[PDB]
Ligand binder design. Sequence first.
Ligand SMILES: *[C@@H]1O[C@H](CO)[C@@H](O)[C@H](O)[C@H]1NC(C)=O
Ligand SMILES: *[C@@H]1O[C@H](CO)[C@@H](O)[C@H](O)[C@H]1NC(C)=O
Ligand SMILES: *[C@@H]1O[C@H](CO)[C@@H](O)[C@H](O)[C@H]1NC(C)=O
Ligand SMILES: *[C@@H]1O[C@H](CO)[C@@H](O)[C@H](O)[C@H]1NC(C)=O
Ligand SMILES: *[C@@H]1O[C@H](CO)[C@@H](O)[C@H](O)[C@H]1NC(C)=O
Ligand SMILES: *[C@@H]1O[C@H](CO)[C@@H](O)[C@H](O)[C@H]1NC(C)=O
Lengths: 237, 198, 246, 50
Amino acid sequence: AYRFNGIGVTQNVLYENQKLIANQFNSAIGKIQDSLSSTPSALGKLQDVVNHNAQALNTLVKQLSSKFGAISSVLNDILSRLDPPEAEVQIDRLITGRLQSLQTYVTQQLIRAAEIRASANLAATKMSECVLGQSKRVDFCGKGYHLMSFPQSAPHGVVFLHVTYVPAQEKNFTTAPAICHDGKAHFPREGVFVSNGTHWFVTQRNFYEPQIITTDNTFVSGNCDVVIGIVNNTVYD
Amino acid sequence: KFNGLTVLPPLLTDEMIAQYTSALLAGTITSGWTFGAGPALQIPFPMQMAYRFNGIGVTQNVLYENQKLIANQFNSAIGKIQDSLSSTPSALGKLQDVVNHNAQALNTLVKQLSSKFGAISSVLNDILSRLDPPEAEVQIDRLITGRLQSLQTYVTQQLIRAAEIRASANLAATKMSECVLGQSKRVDFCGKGYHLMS
Amino acid sequence: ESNKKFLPFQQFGRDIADTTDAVRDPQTLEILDITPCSFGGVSVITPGTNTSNQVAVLYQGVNCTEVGSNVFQTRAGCLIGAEYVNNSYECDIPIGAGICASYQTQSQSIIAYTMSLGAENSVAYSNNSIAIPTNFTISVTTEILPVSMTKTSVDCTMYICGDSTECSNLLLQYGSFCTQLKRALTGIAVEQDKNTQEVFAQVKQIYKTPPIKYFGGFNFSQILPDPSKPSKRSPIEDLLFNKVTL
Amino acid sequence: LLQYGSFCTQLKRALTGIAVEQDKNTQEVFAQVKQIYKTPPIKYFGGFNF
Ligand SMILES: *[C@@H]1O[C@H](CO)[C@@H](O)[C@H](O)[C@H]1NC(C)=O
Ligand SMILES: *[C@@H]1O[C@H](CO)[C@@H](O)[C@H](O)[C@H]1NC(C)=O
Ligand SMILES: *[C@@H]1O[C@H](CO)[C@@H](O)[C@H](O)[C@H]1NC(C)=O
Ligand SMILES: *[C@@H]1O[C@H](CO)[C@@H](O)[C@H](O)[C@H]1NC(C)=O
Ligand SMILES: *[C@@H]1O[C@H](CO)[C@@H](O)[C@H](O)[C@H]1NC(C)=O
Ligand SMILES: *[C@@H]1O[C@H](CO)[C@@H](O)[C@H](O)[C@H]1NC(C)=O
């Protein structure tokens, strides 16, 4: 209920709908395992790391069979087949090629590590801001109005489960900016003036809950001849 | 069209990006921030702007009693933007730097093909038709090594540039999500002052 | 034929890239332009082998005149083996400037089309009408983020020279590249450890859930650890660890 | 050149990855909404000029 108050909805909305909210949360949680299992490419990001590492190691190992312009790619035979004063010419090319391969591998590893560090920093910030508190940044902890988040661990990574509030079943209404009464303008404290067709109420932000217009949910602060589009009606005391 | 170097077209055309921008503008004009968290809900524009004024910490009657002045100020500020963009010569240097860097890199890679790297000539066709097989390999090897080194340098530079471009794109996406689809309270994140809209 | 104004003493021609692009015929004084012959790359578009074996071929940046019956000309080149239709769908296989390809039953064949951005909508703006919701929905979404990668170490002498003393003595003459390589790899490994340390070690206390699992009707069995299994992992964690496999 | 090894495969892989990331950047930045909203024919918004 505190979180509902945080997103802009009163507590009685939750306290009168506890069972429905619990059932919706339970069903949404239950669907998560099926959603994860059914999708084949659900965890591609975590598989790409293993694929890249294996490919790099395999290429580095496979590079050992190149000759780079020598009689053979094996030092043991050259040592036991030639003489010292002429083996260096063959050895130098192999040395150069293997050094170049090692340098290429190291550079690629550094370039990948930078991006991995950036992703880890983003994950740490998300864990700090969406799990240990409630966020107001748009589309930072899911789509909708953020309520809470739950972490889970995965090979070489983390998984976040975001719980969000989504409005539904909207309706047409007629509205006015202010209400004129006794030559005085009236503005809503929090909410908006609404009308079903014959009577005027004041309702809250993201949930239809009409109330009788009273001096306890409005303030006067002005006159009736300045606001554009003002509608005049009685105000109860 | 160079020697083995080709440029590929982007998947999305300019018209499609313009359509996306127009859709975003229409949504944020006719619905406020509601369409960014669910179904789009209609609301008159002055009511939405009074809501934003209430968001920054000012009451609604301040706006409702000064509608014409605020509209005139907004219109003048919008009108000055085109003149400000046109007058400044280095207004769009960030976007020009990308094209300049790409063109310079491609030109250097193409120009590197005329070096000899310690051979009789830099053209394979003449060496093939001027020498014999048992002695052309000595000349060919140096050219091969030099061109391989040039290609490796170009690829490394391209990767290093792509990393920074990706970072900038991520920042742009975050800004679009937080300043356009909603109202931000972070200081100096969506302009200087108290943020209203983008 | 060349429209180039050659001075009576020049013979060849060059460009910015410094390559030949014009020449004069020794027998008949006439300037001729030289252009490279057409070349390009070939791409193969296919669905999964489990689906079908039909393929389409895209020649990149090539006019269709130079190069089964159905041939199409896109700004990305020449497409062979696919049919173009007006029907716009969500993109399946990207091709070029707003063109996508898919495997559709129409029977089954490969079609090419223009991608669709979305469904058209128009909200009814007006002077004095508003829309207010009357109900809500609770949604749960997932996000996946990598943290760390594998830590590796390399020995210079064993990789390059194995156990050859002469090779080691020859390599010793080059310099000190291996020290730099070792330093880089060690730094990478230390950063890899630090990433997980920063991401996961957020709290300084080990809190424990109460024995009774009642929280006002909310069910948390899918995310809380399962004591029955030895590794003490939630069912979702079990699924995640089973899915990702080398 | 065939005797040297397999550097060209790595070069091609790097360039392809760069291109795919280049497409993904614009896809993430611009494709935010799933509906194509249209502005009303009458361009009056309480005195604001767009
Ligand atoms: C609100 O009014 C518009 C215009 O009359 C209408 O198209 C829309 O369906 C209405 N909203 C609902 C939820 O019916
Ligand atoms: C609007 O509210 C009044 C107050 O109860 C009610 O009498 C009236 O019937 C409502 N309008 C409609 C169309 O129901
Ligand atoms: C109340 O509103 C009606 C309609 O706008 C208007 O004719 C009338 O003069 C208003 N009452 C007063 C006291 O001005
Ligand atoms: C292909 O060749 C024809 C020959 O008339 C030409 O008209 C057409 O423009 C060429 N296509 C492209 C893409 O240049
Ligand atoms: C798309 O529709 C137009 C309508 O005139 C038609 O000319 C064109 O051939 C169509 N495209 C096809 C059938 O691929
Ligand atoms: C909205 O109100 C203005 C008065 O500021 C009026 O001129 C305009 O016609 C109204 N819109 C419609 C659709 O009548």
